[PDB]
RNA sequence: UCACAAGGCUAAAACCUUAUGAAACUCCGAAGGGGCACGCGUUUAGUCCGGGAGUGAGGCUGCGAGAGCUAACUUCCGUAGCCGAGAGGGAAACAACCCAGACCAUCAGCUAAGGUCCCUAAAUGAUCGCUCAGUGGUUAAGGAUGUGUCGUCGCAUAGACAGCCAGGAGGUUGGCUUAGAAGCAGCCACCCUUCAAAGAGUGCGUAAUAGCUCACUGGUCGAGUGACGAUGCGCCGAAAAUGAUCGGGGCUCAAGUGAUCUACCGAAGCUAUGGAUUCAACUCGCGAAGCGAGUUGUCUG
RNA sequence: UCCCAAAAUGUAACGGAGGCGCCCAAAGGUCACCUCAAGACGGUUGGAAAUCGUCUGUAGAGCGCAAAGGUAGAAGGUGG
RNA sequence: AUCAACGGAUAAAAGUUACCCCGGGGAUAACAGGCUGAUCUCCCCCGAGAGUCCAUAUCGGCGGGGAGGUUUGGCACCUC
RNA sequence: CACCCCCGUGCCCAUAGCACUGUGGAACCACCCCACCCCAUGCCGAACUGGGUCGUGAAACACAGCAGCGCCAAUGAUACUCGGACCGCAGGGUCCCGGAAAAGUCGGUCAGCGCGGGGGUU
């Protein structure tokens, strides 16, 4: 990930393949002018759960995570990105994609697998030691079967930011 | 005389002349008596040297200069800080 | 409740009066009977009972009122207004006033 | 469809979509590209169309709702008062807003189910998917 | 600060007509040397689109 | 407060996660606007007293709303500008739009909006592109291997897409469902064997069968080729009554159209010269104000 | 009174809604004192709210009537 | 003092005219035209389902986009 | 402002507030104690009010810790918008030029400045 300038006059990048962005922690709050194509190609791979080394004009390599993206309505194309400057030992609460594995002895019976929360907020994992996904077994489930927070495996020293009895994956009936 | 209502339901001509608002603003040389605000309740409560009339109207007690005090919003005061 | 002090205090219309405020902390058997000037956040006179009372505690009632009336008169404090806490203006507190009213 | 109770009558004005994500609830969605007034019966057409196509499941999310009264021409008039509440109920839909989103059905099982629904709508639309993380 | 009236005052809002009057410009082509004060620079910004500004 | 979307939960109200709508909702909240003081400035009006009025049918456009069909050359407000009372240029024609406010004279000059093939003033101008429909110079949903430019997903000289030779599955006329339902009216699945390969299989055929093909498999060939989307200009959709047309002729061998650049035309605007008027300050003729003359400035629908 | 009304005032319509033509010798003056609606748990009539009790409790109450503003340091509620 | 038609014409007051008369109004209706096109008339889109089987031979629920200006209207612009 | 601390009162109404854990007692403050009368509870000394110690700092208060909740809250980009100039039959939309939110995020806080009196530095 590479970028150029940073002023408040954005006519030089407007028409061009660029997205105006920012990175902050509690020291340096540097403004950007990164490539739209590159950010799109890469952000789709890494999302919020992943981070990437961003080298500015010349050479100042920095590890950063994606905080929030404010895309244009009408045309779904992104317009502004917010990066969070990663420390070394401790990160923030990260929303993790809740995916599914295997068929359900309820899905084939009459119903279907419904992931209520598509992303899950998790307390103090450790940066560069963040789960890129979240595999959840569904096979044990029938009709009326819910899976809460206190039913999900957390990869080494991770804690749940969400409520203990918050419904994550529920298998629903037909019609 | 028929069984139908003496007053026909669904109207709208109804409304009233109506006035109100602030009369003297922050940094104005007032004489004594000069009304500073017309209000319903106590949008602005009376401050130093400012009297409050029956209809919550705020008038000057002594000649001077109008100063507005906006205490965080909800508690507002108009006072007089004389030039003498 | 606590509404009583703020009720009595707010009804003592501060700088519109010009006059000085006379606090009283008749909650204990140790007063403060302070003379406070409205404008400047300053106390002018004041007469307590904590350091020497001569044995009296609710009897010192007039003594501390008489002491203050004398303590004020030195500075020339003539015009004043009293302010009770939740104090009903009857015994220990009514004395402090009746002793100041007569003591100058 | 229609709302339970309210005020009776309204007004009218327009500008770009306020509260309409892309993901949430479902996997694929349908997005308005033009500003309109989506009739109650207009949605009830789309529901029914998509409903039939999926047969069993009902994994269709109707994000829009007709929270708006519209009035009408008793026969001719003008000499007389304000007009009849009971013409239709509408949902003001500005570009970007998600009207419908589908769950569990395949990519094509949705491309087509939405294509049919589009034909019952007074405005241009487009089908959508994932990567929309503002709040979850 | 050289200023000249290049566009007509007809069909232009009241305030703009009143400003062009204050700036002492009565005809099109009318030119004058101007003060670098905030109010005189402020008048020239109000009716910018009617004037040709040198410096 | 009222309305409301998916779920949790409990005996539904509440409550929790996700999610919204609001003229008469508001924890927030601009740009603007209004009052006052000052004039750092630049201007030129205002106020008060008294004489005389006329006018109290407004109209369009933009913007902000209600009514109305988010109709009207509609109605009723707000706000700006024009017509009313406004000539001149442009918009074919054309109160209102665009430009610009006409004191008079000239067979002088520069420009605005608009223009520069001929009618008709002035480049049949320069450069890089687009469209081939007379689009330009009649609207939409919807539709389409129309050309131009950028992106996303794949498959490939270890030889793909298309095309011809050739194979077409055994189980099995899958179970259900039926008067029958056999790859092909509808409910559940999409498991297996042989291999170079064949999916309880796509569309047609019969009443159910068969037929005749595809998804997949080699040879022969040889080099790119198939699908979602973005966008520029174009196509279809596209039927009304006296005779046709963009004002016309005519125009692609641009006189259409996107971008940049200059040169000219173009008004009663600006300018040149001459003259007149209005108000003013400045000179003066007179016994004084004032009226005459006389500069300079300014004015004159 | 509210909305229309374009965050000063003002502003139309056979535009959207609703109320008034009173009442109170205390519902006024003043001086004192008091603090609400609702929920949860627990309790004899009762058992949905209720008379009581304890926790939570800027007001979710009240203000003679419509609404808006306002208001608990009271304009609410008691008495001399 | 429902002088409430609420700036309140007298203390005191209803109808009818196709027997009608005058002064005016295109400031204002009926006819026609004009603008609009809700309604009216036609056409197109999608394809549920009917057609023993097969959406499209015919037919086309729910819903959507236009055209016309022959209906009823809206509006009140020249013509009283 | 010698340094601490406590009681009164204030400017300041959440960056000052709550919960949860703790330190405090014989200086101050609270409960506590009894109360027949001043005076008082539409019933009751709960409250006001009167007479005082011990006992205990329990509860309340005071101080101190902590970011779980509240509360404050950027920068960037945006919505919107004065003025300028345009598109579309219309709903609606755009470009230039300044002004510029709300929400959210980084992050910030378990306050800060007074006057008076009291008690300690064995
Ligand atoms: Mg359209
Ligand atoms: Mg007619
Ligand atoms: Mg906030
Ligand atoms: Mg500007
Ligand atoms: Mg503008
Ligand atoms: Mg236009
Ligand atoms: Mg801007």
Swiss-Prot record, chain A:
GO terms for biological process: translation. Residues 105-175 are annotated as: Middle domain. GO terms for molecular function: 5S rRNA binding; structural constituent of ribosome; tRNA binding. The keyword Thylakoid does not apply. Keywords: Ribonucleoprotein, Ribosomal protein, RNA-binding, rRNA-binding, tRNA-binding. The keyword Cell wall biogenesis/degradation does not apply. Belongs to the bacterial ribosomal protein bL25 family. CTC subfamily. Part of the 50S ribosomal subunit. Contacts proteins L11 and L16, the A site tRNA, and the 5S and 23S rRNAs. This is one of 3 proteins that mediate the attachment of the 5S rRNA onto the large ribosomal subunit. This protein has three domains. The N-terminal one is bound on the solvent face, the middle domain fills the space between the 5S rRNA and the L11 arm contacting the 23S rRNA while the C-terminal domain is on the edge of the intersubunit interface and contacts the A site. The protein conformation changes upon binding of a tRNA mimic to the A site, although the mimic does not interact directly with CTC itself, consistent with CTCs presumed role in moderating A site binding. This is Large ribosomal subunit protein bL25. It comes from Deinococcus radiodurans (strain ATCC 13939 / DSM 20539 / JCM 16871 / CCUG 27074 / LMG 4051 / NBRC 15346 / NCIMB 9279 / VKM B-1422 / R1).
Curated annotation (Swiss-Prot), chain B:
Pfam families: Ribosomal_L27. The gene is rpmA. Gene3D superfamilies: 2.40.50.100. Binds the 5S and 23S rRNAs and also the tRNA in the P site. Transmembrane segments: none annotated. One of its GO terms (biological process) is translation. The keyword Ion transport does not apply. Keywords: Ribonucleoprotein, Ribosomal protein, RNA-binding, rRNA-binding, tRNA-binding. GO terms for cellular component: cytosolic large ribosomal subunit. Part of the 50S ribosomal subunit. Contacts protein L18. Belongs to the bacterial ribosomal protein bL27 family. One of its GO terms (molecular function) is structural constituent of ribosome. This is Large ribosomal subunit protein bL27. InterPro entries: Ribosomal_bL27 (IPR001684), Ribosomal_bL27_CS (IPR018261). The keyword Ribosomal protein applies. It comes from the Bacteria.
UniProtKB/Swiss-Prot annotation, chain C:
The keyword Ribosomal protein applies. Part of the 50S ribosomal subunit; part of the 5S rRNA/L5/L18/L25 subcomplex. Contacts the 23S rRNA. Contacts protein L27 and the 5S rRNA. GO terms for cellular component: cytosolic large ribosomal subunit. It comes from the Bacteria. This is Large ribosomal subunit protein uL18. GO terms for molecular function: 5S rRNA binding; structural constituent of ribosome. Transmembrane segments: none annotated. One of its GO terms (biological process) is translation. Belongs to the universal ribosomal protein uL18 family. Keywords: Ribonucleoprotein, Ribosomal protein, RNA-binding, rRNA-binding. HAMAP family: Ribosomal_uL18_B. Pfam families: Ribosomal_L18p. This is one of the proteins that bind and probably mediate the attachment of the 5S RNA into the large ribosomal subunit, where it forms part of the central protuberance.
From Swiss-Prot, chain E:
One of its GO terms (cellular component) is cytosolic large ribosomal subunit. One of its GO terms (biological process) is translation. SUPFAM superfamilies: Ribosomal protein L30p/L7e. InterPro entries: Ribo_uL30_ferredoxin-like_sf, Ribosomal_uL30_bac-type, Ribosomal_uL30_ferredoxin-like. Pfam families: Ribosomal_L30. GO terms for molecular function: rRNA binding; structural constituent of ribosome. Keywords: Ribonucleoprotein, Ribosomal protein, RNA-binding, rRNA-binding. Part of the 50S ribosomal subunit. Belongs to the universal ribosomal protein uL30 family. PANTHER family: LARGE RIBOSOMAL SUBUNIT PROTEIN UL30M (PTHR15892:SF2), MITOCHONDRIAL RIBOSOMAL PROTEIN L30 (PTHR15892). Binds the 5S and 23S rRNAs. This is Large ribosomal subunit protein uL30.
